[PDB]
């Protein structure tokens, strides 16, 4: 089965074979489709297709709701109705059979998304928001006009929202481990902390188990142990921004006495039910105002990282030890100890199907 859409006027129609285009890091799946035209109802002499990755965001200074500012990240276009001799490409398996079904008045089009481009990520809108989805999104548009720059009419075009998604790699990386050794003023004996996760890769909804080991040889007791999962998002719209948002946390009232060790295993599971109030939290790209999970980690193209546009999402686990205060300095120094563990949060490769939009609808 394939998806189709028609213009409000009804004389133009564009077909797509899917909505989620997988990104294999090295090369993205081609975007292919078939446009159904009507030459007698089309004296414009041209029909155009367009692919556009755009950053859309609601202004803060502007008091008007619904209106958003938009910026192009990558734009491509194609001639479709008059067969362009210079734009010849071989037809795909689905495209040729769509031509066979629809007949003469149906023409193909194909794009190729270049690598190192953002994946569809939607920032979570607050309850007071009313406009369209914010963040990075892709859109396929087919229209008719005597020239590229001629004013576009809403009734003479179609538009579909498509996504560029990534799935978990086939093999996990090395187990993430990290440690630190804090040395205090009073004595030459250090406070040692280690942590590690079971595996590098985690799926959405799968619980994260954190292993904590403490070797306290100092004269200060540990008051509390705090574990949290934080979502790191980098935005490179004009200049590189950076924000951190915690998505799950656990505080344990565990204490370590001097010259004593301690070991425990904590469990956490990031999920969206208890993060509804956090405005600006990054979520997977939405086609409409549906519900989607937390944004999956973006796989960078190894050592390229040429300030990828849009939003780059990554996760870490932070283990923090609260140390007692007093003595000479008291409340003036920073006695706490911390360490961070990075990990990957992604979907597995679907067997045959692409995602489905709120499968049991309300």
């Amino acid at each position: 089965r394939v998806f189709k859409k028609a213009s409000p006027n009804g004389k133009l129609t564009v077909y797509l074979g899917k909505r989620d285009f997988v990104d294999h890091i090295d090369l993205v799946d081609p975007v292919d489709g078939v446009v159904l035209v009507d030459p007698e109802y089309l004296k414009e002499r041209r029909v155009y297709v367009t692919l556009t990755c755009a950053f859309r965001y609601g202004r803060e200074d502007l008091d008007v709701l619904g209106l958003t500012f938009r910026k192009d990240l990558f734009v491509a276009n194609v001639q479709s109705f008059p067969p362009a001799p210079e734009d010849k490409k071989p037809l795909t398996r689905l495209q040729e059979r769509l031509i066979k079904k629809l007949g003469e008045h149906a023409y193909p089009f194909t794009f190729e998304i270049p690598p190192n481009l953002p994946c569809s990520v939607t920032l979570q809108p607050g309850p007071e928001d009313t406009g369209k989805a914010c963040g990075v999104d892709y859109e396929v548009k087919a229209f008719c006009a005597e020239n590229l720059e001629e004013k576009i009419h809403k009734r003479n075009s179609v538009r579909l929202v498509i996504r560029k998604v990534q799935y978990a790699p086939e093999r996990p990386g090395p187990q993430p481990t990290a440690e630190t050794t804090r040395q205090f003023l009073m004595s030459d004996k250090p406070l040692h902390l280690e942590a590690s996760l079971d595996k590098e890769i985690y799926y959405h909804g799968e619980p994260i188990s954190v292993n904590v080991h403490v070797t306290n040889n100092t004269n200060k007791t540990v008051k509390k142990i705090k574990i949290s999962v934080r979502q790191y998002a980098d935005i490179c719209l004009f200049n590189t921004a950076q924000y951190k948002c915690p998505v799950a946390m656990e505080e344990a009232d565990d204490t370590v006495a001097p010259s004593s060790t301690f070991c425990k295993v904590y469990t956490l599971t990031p999920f969206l039910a208890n993060n509804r109030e956090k405005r600006g939290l990054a979520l997977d790209g939405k086609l409409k105002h549906e519900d989607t999970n937390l944004a999956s980690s973006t796989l960078l193209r190894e050592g390229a990282n040429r300030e990828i546009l849009g939003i780059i999402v990554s996760y870490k686990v932070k283990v923090k030890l609260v140390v007692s205060r007093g003595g000479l300095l008291g409340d003036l120094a920073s006695s706490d100890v911390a360490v961070e563990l990075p990990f990957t949060l992604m979907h597995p490769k679907p067997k045959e199907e692409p995602p489905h939009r709120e499968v049991p609808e309300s």
């Binding site: 089965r1 689905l94 079904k101």
Partner: peptide
């Protein structure tokens, strides 16, 4: 205004 579906026969 509605993205419908069809089969390619």
């Amino acid at each position: 205004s509605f993205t419908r579906s069809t089969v390619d026969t």
